[PDB]
Amino acid sequence: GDQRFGDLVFRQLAPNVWQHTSYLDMPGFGAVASNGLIVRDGGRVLVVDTAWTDDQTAQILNWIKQEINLPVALAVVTHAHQDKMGGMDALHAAGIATYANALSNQLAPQEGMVAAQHSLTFAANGWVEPATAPNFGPLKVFYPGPGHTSDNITVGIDGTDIAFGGCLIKDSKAKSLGNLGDADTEHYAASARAFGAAFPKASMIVMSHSAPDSRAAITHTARMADKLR
């Protein structure tokens, strides 16, 4: 079940995979939950996305120390908004190697974010160029095209049924596509479907603002995005 740890929530999704959840009271939008992932790969831990803030991200590291007690080898962050990169300084203070889409690192300063230390680049078909993602273990990084943002990336976990859509994917009952302020509305539907096609065996879809869902999250998100065109 859900584990409350200070102001954060942690939920085990698989033997080696947990979801981290943090909250930011955004004036005009309530207290918004954001989810990322924690993956144990043998004797090390890999993180997908920060929490909203440095303090919350340090608390993620504290939870990892108490519940897993292995070094965090790297973190990858999935676009240049605060819910995904707001805690970069906490990762750096902890000595953790950080990775983001090159475009996310380019956008970070203007978005008020600190850039990751390393830039991922992507082949024309969307798969990460492997030399830019060394030692990623089971994390398979895919750029599906522009959607929630132009830089949004996605992550599958090899050896599990889990894929992470970040803010690109909304749950199967969602009423809207959320914050479209930086979105590519023309390309969103295709990008959502490209995420599903990249991880065809993923039956558990994890996303930024809802609990994990079935693949109906992908079909429903794409069908809603069909309207934006």
Residues annotated within a binding site for substrate: 170, 179
Interaction of residue 81 with Zn ion, rule CB under 5 A: yes
Dist. CA 54–CA 57, nearest whole Å = 5
Query: Could you give the count of Cα atoms lying within 13 Å of 83 in the half-sphere of its Cβ?
Result: 23
> Which residues are part of a known binding site for Zn(2+)?
79, 81, 83, 148, 167, 209
Contacted entry of Zn ion, ligand XJE, none for residue 181, CB cut-off 5 to 8 Å set by kind: ligand XJE
Single residue of 32, 73, 94, 174 touching ligand XJE by CB under 6 A: 32
| Segment near ligand XJE (CB under 6 A); pick from 13-21, 24-32, 135-143, 188-196 | 24-32
For the CB of residue 28, give the shortest distance to ligand XJE in the complex, in Å. 8
Interaction of residue 198 with ligand XJE, rule CB under 6 A: no
Radius of gyration of the chain (CA): 16
Interaction of residue 155 with ligand XJE, rule CB under 6 A: no
Dist. CA 200–CA 92, nearest whole Å = 34
Dist. CA 166–CA 188, nearest whole Å = 13
Quick one: 119 exposed, middle or buried, by C-beta within 10 A (0-12, 13-18, 19+)? middle
Interaction of residue 109 with ligand XJE, rule CB under 6 A: no
Query: Could you give the count of Cα atoms lying within 13 Å of 126 in the half-sphere of its Cβ?
Result: 23
| Segment near ligand XJE (CB under 6 A); pick from 10-18, 59-67, 119-127, 176-184 | 176-184
Q: Residues interacting with Zn ion, by CB under 5 A?
A: 81, 167
